[PDB]
Predict the 3D structure of the following.
Amino acid sequence: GNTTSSVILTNYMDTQYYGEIGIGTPPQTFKVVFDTGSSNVWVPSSKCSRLYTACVYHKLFDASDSSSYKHNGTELTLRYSTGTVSGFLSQDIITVGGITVTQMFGEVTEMPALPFMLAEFDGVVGMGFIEQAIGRVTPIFDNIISQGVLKEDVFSFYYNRDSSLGGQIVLGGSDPQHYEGNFHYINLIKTGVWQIQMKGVSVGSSTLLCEDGCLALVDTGASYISGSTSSIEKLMEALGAKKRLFDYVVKCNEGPTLPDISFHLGGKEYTLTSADYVFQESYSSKKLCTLAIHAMDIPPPTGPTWALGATFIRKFYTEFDRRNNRIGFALARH
Ligand SMILES: CC(C)(C)S(=O)(=O)C[C@@H](Cc1ccccc1)C(=O)N[C@@H](Cc1cnc[nH]1)C(=O)N[C@@H](CC1CCCCC1)[C@@H](O)[C@@H](O)C1CC1
């Protein structure tokens, strides 16, 4: 194998980046987010009660329609920073791009309205390690590496700004049409988790934060940049941003005057400008404009960490390299 599949993605409102897979014989197709922050796959099941609003809006996997279906039945609960889900395990043939794989995957049967009634996607595919997998189930990428078809043991993310391609994941390599310069690489703190050491967070020329270093999760499955609550208190107090309930906001006229936020990863600074993290939904002082940053307390062993989600990955085209356990960033071409 020197094969390199690619999955086209849809950007919805800059917060949801989902693409298509097919499961079963003949193939039942689902939209899913590719999450580097988790290691499981699931979709809603035909067995999800219609009392779940989320279950009525999304598409259901039907085992009884599937001649590739092998039964497992093991229960699970999958807990995400935003939202959780419980169902049961099924084996079926799944395909992603050209690639086809026999995968264990969760058929979901309780699906909370919040946050899922808002999901344009039906499903998720965990792009993380077996160390984070509930049930210790082999994740899908390990499963594709065992095939020995990828020209490289890597997959690369491109995430566009609204709208025309919405984004793209390449399995087996990167797509140059979508970045410039060369990749810079940081090794993983430890194998098991898509997570690197971060040296510092500046707000404008001066290092506000992470002075004696901290952790950074590169998470394709997060719409935003997150930090701990105390890192974000202070970061927002730097930006004069004002806490709403869940979100932070600035008045829209000041949006474009906000300073650069930069992230020191490895031997380089990754810089975000206001155009990258303020939702400029207006320019009027009447109006309030949200920021693509928030507080998200991730518990140990992973946490406390920041997560670098879509806000960052839109700016910097990202490569996850399994063979060498590292992540590459390059500037994205839009
Ligand atoms: C509306 C917001 C504020 C943008 S959001 O954060 O609620 C969005 C959710 C993703 C989402 C969007 C729309 C419908 C459903 C779900 C989000 O970003 N969730 C993150 C939260 C997070 C931020 N920093 C760390 N976590 C999230 O929970 N992502 C998980 C993936 C996500 C896959 C898609 C559905 C929900 C879980 C998972 O990657 C993380 O838990 C673990 C690594 C820490």
